[model samples]
Target: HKSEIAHRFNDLGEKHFKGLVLVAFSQYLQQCPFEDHVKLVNEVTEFAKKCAADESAENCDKSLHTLFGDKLCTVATLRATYGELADCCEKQEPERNECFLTHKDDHPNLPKLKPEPDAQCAAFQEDPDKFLGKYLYEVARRHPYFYGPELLFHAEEYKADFTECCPADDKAGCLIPKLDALKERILLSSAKERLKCSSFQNFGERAVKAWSVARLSQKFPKADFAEVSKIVTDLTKVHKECCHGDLLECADDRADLAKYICEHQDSISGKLKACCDKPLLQKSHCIAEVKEDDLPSDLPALAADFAEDKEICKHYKDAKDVFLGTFLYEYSRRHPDYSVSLLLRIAKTYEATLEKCCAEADPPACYATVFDQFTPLVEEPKSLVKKNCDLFEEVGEYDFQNALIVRYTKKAPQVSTPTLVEIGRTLGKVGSRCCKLPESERLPCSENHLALALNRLCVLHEKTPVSEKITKCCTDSLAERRPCFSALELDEGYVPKEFKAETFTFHADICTLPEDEKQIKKQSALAELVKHKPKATKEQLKTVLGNFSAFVAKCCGAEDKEACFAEEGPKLVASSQLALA
Candidate 1:
């Protein structure tokens, strides 16, 4: 049988005759003694010295197809098992992957035939019928399961046809007849037909493709998944019974699948049931609806869904904690001006509080304890004011005011706290001011006032490191350094109302010390003072330096290097003078 299979490849010419013969009897070739395998591969190598004699990719494919018929899944199995012969054959096509059905071409050139084992190759070696059956089943199984409940069953039947149709006595007699049977019995004729059969392979793909869930939902927006699921289950039964294996027949049966599922309307499941069973793909309206009934006393849940639109809120009372949390989340996205972390912490706290409180007998009472817990956060109006100012700055007057109304309306209204009122008044004051400004100027005006006020508060109370230049300037004189930094702390961007001539005298007194000490001290003070002034001019700085110099001349001697130039003198000169222009 092996010799006869090899004899069939004689027409492909002697150039590749041995290589082609090896591919023909690849099933038997693997079982041969190692020396026979080597001798056959060596003779084939010498037969076509120039890489299988420059065969065209199409001609090579035709030769392979003629040799193996439908039994070959792809030429790749030959490449893996036949080693150098596959490489020799691969040299025929540069773009074999693109042009051929399978991209199994091996690297061209190199002269050793080493047969390796792959799933398909191993099966092919065991029995050609077994390998062919497995390959056919895999391809058939990928088609919709409805095309055949068990493709392996049909694959085996096709294999039996091969065994009976192609006889051992006349191997040539089997080719055309066996292929024709495979086409009618297994391949199922058209690519489009195979696609349709494959489409119904699984429950998910069948539901989506056969029932058109998207189109159905679009037509019936209020229809829940339970309704859709029922329809899917109903159609699945019909498809299984009538149209499963028959490809062309399944397409025809789709008219009936659509007709029966769509037209046979079941009674509407109660509104609450529909809401509870709402598919996750839709807005969580069902969960949102049933949530109110289940957690009837859960205030936070009520507040969570509450919106200003009466139609939206009419379904259930809006939860205050959820409302505030959602508003803050949305507000943070809109305005990058606020401390996002601060807002997030507050929003998360409110949500966590709701989670704890909403699960109680009276969520409102439970939430009271939660609110009292966060009272300390209110005293620090910086976070509250900054957050609200951001809201006002972004939305302008009306929306900010309306948002406030929506949030506070649901409140319990009593607490051992002034912070909440403080936050409200602060918000109201900024909201009022922003309202007066034109819409174009509102955000900038609100942001500037809020920023300046926040800056001043932070400066007055916030601890900051004394700069290196300042520390070195007052290096030896802790007394002088302390006073210099203190002077630098005088209200930024403006003189304090109480600042007087004696303030200058206070500066002059420091200058009256030794020259080195006084010069560096004065430079450090000037640098610290002007560090925050981005718009100051070079001439303005020079004028300030001249005033300080005069004050120093009156206060200390030029030879007094200790008072005139401290250890920080060079550093101050480098930092401040270079920065002036």
Candidate 2:
């Protein structure tokens, strides 16, 4: 009777028998012992008769084929042996079949199962390795299904636990003895299963606790458990309020921990406040030595926290570089359009200025003064320079040199020769020293000097005009005149612009006026000259002012104000005193 029934279904081909066989018999085989084949046959026969009698014969036939198909049969066997999975099966046709064929390893979503200890397995539990290999093989043979990839990837996590439960002093006394079969099962599992299985899934309280403990331990290796316990408890409460399960949200949790330490550290209520005062670079050593283990992981979290709070960062006013660097790095990350190189350039400028103006013994206070003065330049450069000659007065030569280059590259093309030569001397001198710099640093130095020279020349040309045509020529579009002017001193053999020589009047009679009266006119013109050469030293300004006084005494009282100043302006301003200034 059994053979007849089996042959009848087998002859129908897999399409007809597949779904029907699986839906009706797959679960029964899993729940019942194989000795009950008679019950299984009866169940299948009952299902077949009902399907044959149903009005929807096509639905019946399709369902039968899917149930009895070889692939689905294997899938059913896997589910039956493994117990309930999280929904490894898909709903549609070929995709449903494909899930079982190749992608099972990707099913980390499936809940992992831990077998219940049983009386029958007591001896095997004492030595899991001995029983593990053969037991898995016997089960797989009956179901004929592959063990999942996740099972294999996480196999090590449970290995010690299982070993502790089951001890095997030697191979002879082991239950299963060999691991080859188990290894084979994992190797054959899906690729996806191997990869994502280990990733953190839920940011549940369980996960938070685990991560905090793990992260805290890695950061503070020597802290005794007692000290860490208090910190961890407080941190957990803080995280519970905002540390929802998402990765970025968890990053916020990490940030909050740092913020808490920074804000409360100095208070009587603060446990880890001392950690907040330590130098950023040396915090790890400081915490390690103090035997304090209350702080979170140092840079990544604290920096993230600090970057967001404009007020919190101000607390580090003494450690401004740390705040500035951290803020810039964080800003660049959040704003992808801003490259990290921009922040690095800004930081390089800060460091260079610090080296020039700050004394080692009291660098912080020195830096704060200079940083406060220069910080506004970051906010207001072009407009501020346009209004105030004194803006660059205190800026050192190197810093001013770089600043001028950055400000004047586009403006330099429109300067006159006398002015160009005046600025070029200073630029050339700077450039000469620049040549001694290593090959790598030399080009940038030269480029900066050239940029500043052009800018200074344009300002000088504007202050002390040589000719109406020359002023117009120097102020023309950079492409029309800059190349020629730029070539005059920097590039040899470049054709210079043609211009009528112009003159100036010094009005030497002004020197004959009362010292206070003469001082008023001289001061007004001096302000303009200072604007022309912003980077000039006070000594340079004094020398140029005194020379102008001498020139006025020597050449003033002329027939025309224009002729007197023009003839003497170039001679006095462009002469030895002008060059020295």
Candidate 3:
């Protein structure tokens, strides 16, 4: 437990150890508001203190039975927790929690899952507090990968939804969407877990190790190629030893990777630098989304020799997840222009081709025309890339950059107006510079700058971890990250509804405003204006600014400056909305 809490704050001691007892209460009985959770923990602490004086073997046993049989626990977690550590009740208060923390493994097996029956709704009616506890007891063990904070965060969402539904006629209708969203995240995490676990299972690290070689070799092309091969060899051994449905096993490789990737970043540069620079090593998808630099001799492409490999049929049969996963990993990186869903279309097509051919005696011979089949698939995405680049061809730099300001603002409300404007402007600069090149080079030039934009945001979000919805989207693969971030939900709750600008107005302040305060007043007003017309294009907004500037120049010197400013300042905004229309 080398923790954030441990570093800044000291002296958790035995009392802190025992507080997990409080968690079983607080975590389960979440319906109890405010200090009620602390109240339960305090009551249990005092009860444990009283138990030891009556600590004769006979006296404590009956008391232990009494303590447990109370309405405090009808489920596995509390019973198992107390059952495991009840011996701690014999110790003094100082040692009790320490005792509880130590012999934590002694609990009896959890009771088998009970039926989810109508009796539960009746029980919920009888006592809502105890019912919430009982339901959560079932939930925690069901997804063992969930940590305490995630469980609490999840339960809050669950409790909110279920509470709305329980007294209503449409309970299932209300609750299923909540459960579906939850299940999608679980399956997203779960299947990849199965993919890795099965990599160890059927193939026994042979074929999967080869795929890792192809991937890692491409990722670190500047590295000593022999060194990259040996690195995977060592890394895969850790997987064999570490991962068979165990967290500790999986953690070992993460630790092992930190030793290699983080420590040796000088030799291993490019995209994986983000992997090394984490607040916590495990937070990002640095490992899974490895960069696809140029390939080495050791890692071959799939066009000819790959499809002809005799092992393709057997490996596909043994574990399709493994084949499918690395297949996406390898194929998509080489053709990074393709989007994720598009690559998935190719994967689906590849699977259909395998379905036809892998059944035949000469599966290798069947793939003779496999590369031919893929050539036609390229034309569609190729044309799609051109359509977008064609827009870049027509648009000026200012319009493109300003368009991103509007784009970034919606997704990243927490980002300051200045920083957001700066980023969009920079991205616009890169796009113009990169996109001017012909189709022969524009794809990668744009690709590289997009990656640069993403990495800057990635680094920014890391510096401010407690903030930003972006880190989740950004930690995705670079090729996929466009759609990944595009899918982020905008929370416009931060902007004030009545704060819309009219007339783009500014009182001239008699034409002699101080520079420092003047800039703040102007920029801060501009912040509101930028937000107010979020839908306006970059050019339209800039046109408004230029018009407002010119209006001020003439009106600031006018004999009747106030009336001149009022009449003309608005014409600037009127034109913007007119253009926006």
Give the best candidate by TM-score: 3
- lDDT per model, in order? 0.36, 0.38, 0.51
Poorest 10 consecutive residues of model 2 by lDDT?
A: 191-200
Query: What lDDT is obtained when candidate 2 is compared to the true structure?
Result: 0.38
How large is the C-alpha RMSD of every model relative to the true structure?
A: 30.9, 34.1, 19.6
lDDT of 1 by residue, 416-521 (tens): 1122222233334556665465543444345433332222222212123223333332332211222232234222334212312222233324644656345445
Cα lDDT tens digits for candidate 2, 1-581: 22333333434433223222332232223333332322344455555554545534333444332533323334334455544331334445554443432322211222222243334246455665434332332232232222121222223323543454444354323423224434333332312111111111212343334333433443443343433444566655544421111112222333444555455445312334465665431332233224323333332442325323323423444765444443343322222221122223344455554555443343443444443443443333223222322333454443343333323321342334234334533553454455555643343344433333443444445445643444453444321233334333222222333322222234545646766456445544444443355445555655666777776755555556556776767766556335544
> Runs in model 2 with CA error above 4 Å?
1-413, 416-494, 497-501, 508-549, 553-581
Cα displacement (Å) at residue 450, model 2: 16
Better of 2 and 3 by lDDT: 3
Worst ten in a row by lDDT for model 3 = 1-10
How does residue 563 of candidate 1 score in lDDT? 51
Q: What does candidate 3 score in Cα RMSD to the true structure?
A: 19.6
